Amino acid sequence: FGRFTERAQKVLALAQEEALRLGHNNIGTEHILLGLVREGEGIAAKALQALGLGSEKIQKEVESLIGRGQEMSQTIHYTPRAKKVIELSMDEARKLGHSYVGTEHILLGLIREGEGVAARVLNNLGVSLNKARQQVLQLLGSNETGSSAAGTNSNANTPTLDSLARDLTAIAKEDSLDPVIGRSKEIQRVIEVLSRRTKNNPVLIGEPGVGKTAIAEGLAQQIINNEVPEILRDKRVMTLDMGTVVAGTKYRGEFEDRLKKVMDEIRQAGNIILFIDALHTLIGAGGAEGAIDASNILKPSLARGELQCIGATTLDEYRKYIEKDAALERRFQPIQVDQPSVDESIQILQGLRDRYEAHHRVSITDDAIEAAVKLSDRYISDRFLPDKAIDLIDEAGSKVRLRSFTTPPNLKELEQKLDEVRKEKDAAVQSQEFEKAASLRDTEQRLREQVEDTKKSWKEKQGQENSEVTVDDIAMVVSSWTAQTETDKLLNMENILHSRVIGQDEAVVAVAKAVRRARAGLKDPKRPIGSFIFLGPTGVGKTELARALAESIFGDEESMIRIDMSEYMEKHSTSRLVGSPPGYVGYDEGGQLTEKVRRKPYSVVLLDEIEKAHPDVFNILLQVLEDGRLTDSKGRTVDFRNTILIMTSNVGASELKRNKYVGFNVQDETQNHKDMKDKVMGELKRAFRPEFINRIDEIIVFHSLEKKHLTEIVSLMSDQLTKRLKEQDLSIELTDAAKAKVAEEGVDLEYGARPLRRAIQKHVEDRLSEELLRGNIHKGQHIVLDVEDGEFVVKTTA
Amino acid sequence: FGRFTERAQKVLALAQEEALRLGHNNIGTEHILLGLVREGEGIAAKALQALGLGSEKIQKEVESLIGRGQEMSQTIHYTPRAKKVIELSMDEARKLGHSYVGTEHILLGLIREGEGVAARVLNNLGVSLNKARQQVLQLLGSNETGSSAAGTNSNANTPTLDSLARDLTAIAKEDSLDPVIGRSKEIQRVIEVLSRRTKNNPVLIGEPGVGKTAIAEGLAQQIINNEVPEILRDKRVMTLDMGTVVAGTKYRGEFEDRLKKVMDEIRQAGNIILFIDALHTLIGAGGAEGAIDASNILKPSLARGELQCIGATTLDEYRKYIEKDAALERRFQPIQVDQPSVDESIQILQGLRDRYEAHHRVSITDDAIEAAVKLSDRYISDRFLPDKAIDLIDEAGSKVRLRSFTTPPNLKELEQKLDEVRKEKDAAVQSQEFEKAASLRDTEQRLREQVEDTKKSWKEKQGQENSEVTVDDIAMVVSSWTAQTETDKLLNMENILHSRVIGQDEAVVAVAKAVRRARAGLKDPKRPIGSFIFLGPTGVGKTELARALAESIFGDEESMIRIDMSEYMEKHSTSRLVGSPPGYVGYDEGGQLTEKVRRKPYSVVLLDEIEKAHPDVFNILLQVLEDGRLTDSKGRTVDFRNTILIMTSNVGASELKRNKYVGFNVQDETQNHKDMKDKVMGELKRAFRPEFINRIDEIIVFHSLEKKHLTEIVSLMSDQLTKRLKEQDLSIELTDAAKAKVAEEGVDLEYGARPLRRAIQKHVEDRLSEELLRGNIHKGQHIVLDVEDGEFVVKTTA
């Protein structure tokens, strides 16, 4: 593997030595056995010494196979039998914890593969093979955190702790706990509120989403040893774990019975600390429905202080417990739990790096880890800032680790050859045709040593990746899904936003810098990554930048919400037939807008045409842009805190859609362009209040239609066509010249831009499908549609 | 522990004495053992004398396992075995509830921890380890006070009281029942309802939720001694306990059967009292569902006086029983249970004080206790008058006690040092030399004694708090949630409200004065602490005073409800624009207002624009002012304990949202103020009917936009930026010079003072994030935005 211990490796090498000492050309498992007993009193060796085996005794049996002397050091590698015994030992060390592998596992693995060369050595020398595996097993993997013992005494605690549940305190006597991270100052605030015995219940409110449970392990460690008052002396810390409760329970009544039992034993009161994660669920209050109504027993328990407990809730959760009162107000008392401070995230990362050495490429790159956080919060953006983080780490901490064994030097062709050989070889002997297989057989094995030699020349491709988790890598992986290539995304955001939005640079750079500003990692991710107003007509600019922001901001353009404010009027978007209006603005606020962004805290949220809606909608939007949150949909809190809010506007649209027109000359065209990139910022102001527009980071400017838009419509539609031909394979691109010939059947004055579908269909879809049938084009290679002399032409390229 | 018997402590000191008397110098367990047998006939000592161990006999063995001689009297403290034996005694006293650990427990713990020289002494002197702990065990911990009767009886009473459950009367003939103390005046009307035959069932109505259950123990005591009614000198009080019934059961039918059985045994009729907590659940009447319908058996039982029982009910419950009729109301007959009078509260506080001295603190401070009540009633204000109180007492009654153990005087640096020692020492030996650790090792334990010496110099911070609670502290806990720093809050209310409201002192002092009156004791403890109308167009002062009122009035800035009355007219966001579908005023009375204030009964209620509300609304708010309560949302009563009802008005607007303006004179600005601070207090009255407003006291005055009112808005918006940046960990402040450059792009006449947020976005948000991105300012340093010579400058500080 790359995780083994000395003693293991040492028992193994001793085998090769005995192979040759005994004349065995191929180092049998029999020699692995010798290896084990020849390492003397190693965990394997020692085991063998118990069963009654000396290095010699093994070696004689071993010698009775091939025996002295038929070793010229010819093909002195292991036997396939012996190779199996080793593979088993690695797993036999997973078994005994051990991420590495000890001596024992090698003897244990030997036993497992019990009919081999080894096996026979022990089973001939009067040692039952499993009697040997016993003996090794009962001599540990040799992985510990150190230990000691001295015993305790009887105490009241006996009935309780069985049920339900694990106790942090036990595991901390011989420590194995970690802080882990914090959110340290939160732990302190508990002890006033808990060295209380009448509103003695702390209640942590944050978000999921900070690793709330980290703060909890904090308490455990510090409340035992040793700075705690005599108030909270005679302490036990008990966690009430949900998982054991749900198991073996088929109904609500039985679940309640288990909770009742806990409450009865809870008489250990005021000297016991109970940790209840997700506190809200038990109270069962608020909403259309609850979950379970433990509250009846639980409310007096909190008031009495018999249940002296710690509640872990999120943004939304608390409301449905303090609303019941007043043994929630003579219980609960609040404590500040972050909307992640970036640094706290980072520390979690460092802690779990070595275990992504079981996901190899981590431990390290440290620098990449900080980035894991920093790039992730802003680039996907969806999750919570430490999940976000870690995703970059392990992804990148694997992506390249895949690239490790992709080839030899490209001697993958070698392996391919060795196969083909076997066939020939075989089929020839299968007729027999002895030497007509023989030379093929030889050619096979030629290949074989070579294969393995150059597949392990790509141990150099291992040494590259197998502990770097690389900066660029981490960044790349966030960029891949949906430091370097996210900060190249941030710094070069404008470049990325420019490549998708054509014309109106004015808007792009304004957004670019504002998001990039946020994207430093600083601005605070408790409030959107960007607020914006995106001006421009219904045409060209706005949406496209929002999308392009998904690309630049998030890594790929694979996250852009878009909610219409005209639905937030009550009407103008359920007009006549279309849509469902169930109290319609109430539906949008009350559910729709909040639900969508609650799924994706990620995306560029584009709240469309805030012109047509009344100023009242905007007061609501203003909270979204400022607070970074809105609360609706049964009291749920929606994170707009790393969204990019973009509110669009236009009512002068027509002027930005104004034809180029030959008003006298072709410089009426060049007076139509320049004019429209000016005209926009006043079409914003005219249909609604200013108060909203000021929340916005920057005022983004766009414009559209002229003459010259028709051949741009052809370039939107033809690209949707060719992409639906990509879905089940076919790579197409149209050159602009070919889009022109399509437009040629579209400059009807009497039938508008209707003929464009038909001519795009005719020259692209229809033409490609009727060309795939010819064999002119090739599915899965790149197909360029151009006009050359004057007519449309399909050409092919790789 | 920090609480012990003589006997315990005596066994301990004798160990050190024996260390040297025998040649040792470190007290192992051997000296503790010696301690036990040398303490003579304390329960540990006595035990050892029984099993056959003399003081002599122990000390000689002890001495034969080091002793004679190592004598030179090296520092005699424990060693780790010996420390373990002690840890066990603490738990061996917990075991039998001794909160003042006794002799026995030390021998019990010694045995348990039966290793070290002691163990060997005892196992040498013809006593097995368990034979020794047995002897001790079987004689008390020495912490009793129960029993006072040695009588015996058998009577018909047997089947009933068995089942199900206790006998309050017994425990008060054992000298172990407390009154507790209520709610004393509550108990008396019950005794009428208890000597009857018809109407013989009491039903206590209040809030549950006041510690109501105290009144019940009152009865127990009075049924015993000594002048009480004729059947009350022939009555026994037996408790109907829900907990035993539900235990071992999980079917509703079985619960009913058991209740039927209880009624069968109730044949002690006309001489039996059943105590039923939370009476409603059994009756099952009213609501949209039951809770289990005992009524078939229960109703005739209740009316006849074969079940003469005591009901503990709440705000709503009674209504849903007289509706049931006609044996429900026959049985019932009412008694007044208050949310106890200010004085009643106080007595409860004092009564449970010593056990927050078992929660090692309060014991005292008296001024803080009285305050716990008084301050609670007005400051949070989220329960009934005593529940609040006691919570302050223990919270604060720990908060400073937490500060007890967190430093030496400042000799915390010692502990820090002692660490560094371990390291140098360790790593040096860990490589070796021996002596390359040695002097470092030695330096460590030198340090250690110093460390520990000054950590127990911070027993002085224990003697400070371990009978205190602090005034300021109790007050602090009330400030924490939402005497001294709440009555300093009361006294300095004005100062606190002034520091957070800028513009119109008239308003501030007015709220201050009504609240400070109320907050001194005189004013309803169940109606708003201030009802107010807050005048002037939205922009300056109104909300901000409501907030500032939370800070001064409640002790922290938080908890303020806020409902807009202008929506409640059923025509403004009834379905019109962004709100929710209901027929809006019906929703507000029927649910919204009442539910919201029910969560925090203290909340600053801001009923916005009572002017623009329907005249029915004025009645709804008026009902809060009259009753102090509103009853809605399925008959729940919302306690507006010391809410601050704040009714807003946006009128006066034309002058109060004008331009202060140079009218031809620069004294048109300073007369636009003087005019505006006049114009509001007459503009409120015209927009709504008098019937409401007359039960609204102070007329709170505010304005907004001017020349000058504008520049007060700039400083509100810049402050909205700086707080949202704190969550990640960025400390920002704008000095006035930077707020000025921001104003530079928003003193437009053609766009007003709307641009200011936007100009903050470019010059503050955008500038700081682009300054953080360049790293000239940083997280955890205070960042000043100033203007120097007409240009903005971002600085870094500390």
First to last CA, chain B: 43
Contact B180, B217 (CB under 8 A): yes
Q: What is the DSSP string of B599-661?
A: HSTT---EEE-TTSS-HHHHHHHHHHHHHSEEEETTTEEEE-SS-EEEEE--TTHHHHTS---
**Does B758 lie at the interface with A, CB-CB under 8 angstroms?**
yes
Query: Helix, strand, or coil here: B239?
Result: strand
Contact map slice: A 494-533 vs B, CB within 8 A? 513-514, 516-518, 520, 522-527
Alpha-carbon span B40 to B449, nearest angstrom: 32
Contact map slice: B 404-463 vs A, CB within 8 A? 404-406, 462
Q: Do A153 and B109 touch (CB under 8 A)?
A: yes
| Sign of the Cα pseudo-torsion (A152, A157, A163, A167, in order) | negative
Inter-helix orientation angle B103-112/B43-51, to 10°: 50
Query: Helix, strand, or coil here: B596?
Result: helix
Contact map slice: A 646-675 vs B, CB within 8 A? none
State the smallest CA–CA distance between residue A253 and chain B in angstroms: 6
Sequence-distant (6+) residues with CB within 8 A of B64 are none
Give the nearest chain A residue to B208 (CA atoms). Answer: A326
**Does A342 lie at the interface with B, CB-CB under 8 angstroms?**
yes
* Structure token digits, residue B70: 């190592």
Q: Gaps (C–N > 2.5 Å) in chain B: which residues precede them?
A: 482
**Does B770 lie at the interface with A, CB-CB under 8 angstroms?**
yes
Q: How many angstroms separate the Cα of A615 from the Cα of each of A230, A691, B752?
A: 59, 9, 17
Sequence-distant (6+) residues with CB within 8 A of A229 are A195, B360, B361, B398, B401, B402, B404, B405, B462, B465, B466
* Structure token digits, residue B527: 């109606």
Give the nearest chain A residue to B388 (CA atoms). Answer: A330
Beta-bridge partners for B275: B239, B310
Work out whether strand A792-796 and strand A782-787 pair parallel, antiparallel, or are unpaired: antiparallel
* Structure token digits, residue B263: 């009624």
**Does A174 lie at the interface with B, CB-CB under 8 angstroms?**
no
Residue A201: cis peptide before it, omega within 30 degrees of 0:
no
State the smallest CA–CA distance between residue A36 and chain B in angstroms: 31
HEC sequence for A672-716: CHHHHHHHHHHCCCCCCCHHHHCCCCEEECCCCCCCCCHHHHHHH
**Residue A209 DSSP one-character state:** T
Query: Which of A184, A517, A691 is the best mutation test for B, with the most CBs of B within 10 A?
Result: A517
Q: Is B251 left (phi over 0), alpha (psi -120 to 50) or beta?
A: beta
Instruction: Give the number of other Cβ atoms within 10 Å of residue A391's Cβ.
Output: 20
Beta-bridge partners for A195: none
Q: How many angstroms separate the Cα of A480 from the Cα of each of A148, A371, B115?
A: 49, 15, 62
HEC sequence for A434-498: CHHHHHHHHHHHHHHHHHHHHHCHHHHHHHCCCCCCCHHHHHHHHHHHCCHHHHHHHHCHHHHHH
Sheet with strand B236-240: strands edge to edge = B236-240, B272-276, B309-313, B203-205, B334-336
Which residues in chain A touch residue B418, judged by CB atoms under 8 angstroms apart? none
Q: How many angstroms separate the Cα of A768 from the Cα of each of A719, A727, B438?
A: 14, 15, 86
What's the angle, vertex CA A459, arms to CA A455 and CA A465, rounded to 5?
A: 130
Among B246, B576, B727, select the one facing A338 at the smallest CB separation.
Answer: B727
Give the nearest chain A residue to B558 (CA atoms). Answer: A334
Instruction: Give the number of other Cβ atoms within 10 Å of residue B495's Cβ.
Output: 12
Q: Please enumerate, as own/partner, the contacts of A9-18 that have beta carbons within 8 Å and a separation of 24 or more.
A: A10/A35, A10/A39, A10/A42, A10/A103, A11/A35, A11/A36, A11/A38, A11/A39, A11/A42, A11/A44, A11/A45, A11/A103, A11/A106, A11/A107, A12/A86, A12/A106, A14/A38, A14/A39, A15/A78, A15/A82, A16/A76, A16/A78, A18/A59, A18/A62
Q: Do A325 and B599 touch (CB under 8 A)?
A: yes
Among A524, A617, A626, select the one facing B727 at the smallest CB separation.
Answer: A524
Could you tell me how far CA B54 lies from the centroid of its own chain?
53
Phi, psi at A361, each rounded to 5°? 125, 0
Q: Do A694 and B388 touch (CB under 8 A)?
A: no
- Known binding residues of A for ATP are 206-213, 536-543
Query: Which of B84, B349, B398 is the best mutation test for A, with the most CBs of A within 10 A?
Result: B398
Taking the C-alpha atoms of A568, A574, A579 and A582 in order, what is their torsion angle to the nearest 10 degrees?
A: 60
Q: Do B577 and A690 touch (CB under 8 A)?
A: no
Inter-helix orientation angle A252-265/A295-304, to 10°: 20
Q: Please enumerate, as own/partner, the contacts of B9-17 that have beta carbons within 8 Å and a separation of 24 or more.
A: B10/B35, B10/B39, B10/B42, B10/B103, B11/B35, B11/B36, B11/B38, B11/B39, B11/B42, B11/B44, B11/B45, B11/B103, B11/B106, B12/B86, B12/B106, B14/B38, B14/B39, B15/B78, B15/B82, B16/B76, B16/B77
Alpha-carbon span B153 to B373, nearest angstrom: 45
Which residues in chain A touch residue B398, judged by CB atoms under 8 angstroms apart? 191-192, 194-196, 229, 231-232
Residue with tokens 């967190």: B406
Data resolution in angstroms: 9.0
Alpha-carbon span A391 to A482, nearest angstrom: 12
Largest CA distance in chain A: 111
Instruction: Give the number of other Cβ atoms within 10 Å of residue B410's Cβ.
Output: 8
Buried-state track B597-633, b at ≥16 Cβ within 10 A, e below 16: bbbbbbbbbbbbbbbbbbeebbebbbbbbeebbbbbb
**Does B340 lie at the interface with A, CB-CB under 8 angstroms?**
no
Sheet with strand B782-787: strands edge to edge = B731-734, B782-787, B792-796
Contact map slice: B 76-105 vs A, CB within 8 A? 81, 84, 88, 90-92, 94-95, 97
**Does A155 lie at the interface with B, CB-CB under 8 angstroms?**
yes
* Structure token digits, residue A43: 């965990």
* Structure token digits, residue A100: 């590495």
**Does A278 lie at the interface with B, CB-CB under 8 angstroms?**
no
Burial of B745: CB neighbours in 10 Å, binned 0-12, 13-18, 19+: middle
Q: How many angstroms separate the Cα of B114 from the Cα of each of A149, A150, B18, B65, B108?
A: 12, 9, 19, 15, 10
Alpha-carbon span B714 to B241, nearest angstrom: 63
Largest CA distance in chain B: 113
Work out whether strand B636-639 and strand B629-632 pair parallel, antiparallel, or are unpaired: antiparallel
Taking the C-alpha atoms of A146, A151, A153 and A154 in order, what is their torsion angle to the nearest 10 degrees?
A: 80
